[PDB]
Amino acid sequence: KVFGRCELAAAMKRHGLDNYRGYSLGNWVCAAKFESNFNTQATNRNTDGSTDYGILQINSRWWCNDGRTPGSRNLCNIPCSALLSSDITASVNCAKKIVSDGNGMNAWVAWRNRCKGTDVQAWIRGCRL
Secondary structure (H helix, E strand, O other): OEOHHHHHHHHHHOOOOOOOOOOHHHHHHHHHHHHHOOOOOHHOOOOOOOOOOOOEEEEEOOOOOOOOOOOOOOOOOOOOHHHHHOOOHHHHHHHHHHHHOOOHHHHOOOHHHOOOOOOHHHHOOOOOO
């Protein structure tokens, strides 16, 4: 499902990511746009031999079960393809838990150096929540 600028963020707030762990929604908009660029079906081969799933590019290395990974942990206790669905609540529901380790949005490479240090509100300006 191709997500619009106005479409995705509106859901993430309903999705209960709005200011979640003090992280402003614009981060959540921006991060999605940097990891899969509003593509929910987005999956990628991690070089270390695991795979990225979900619009939030959630790494199957220990988060989910993609059926190709030895030593996968599955902490989120979901199949990886539930991250690829037209419902945001699967991806979001384990992204909450990714910050739920308290190890920050530093789990996402894209926010990490390309979405920090900028105007945060700039994703959610001109859209209604």
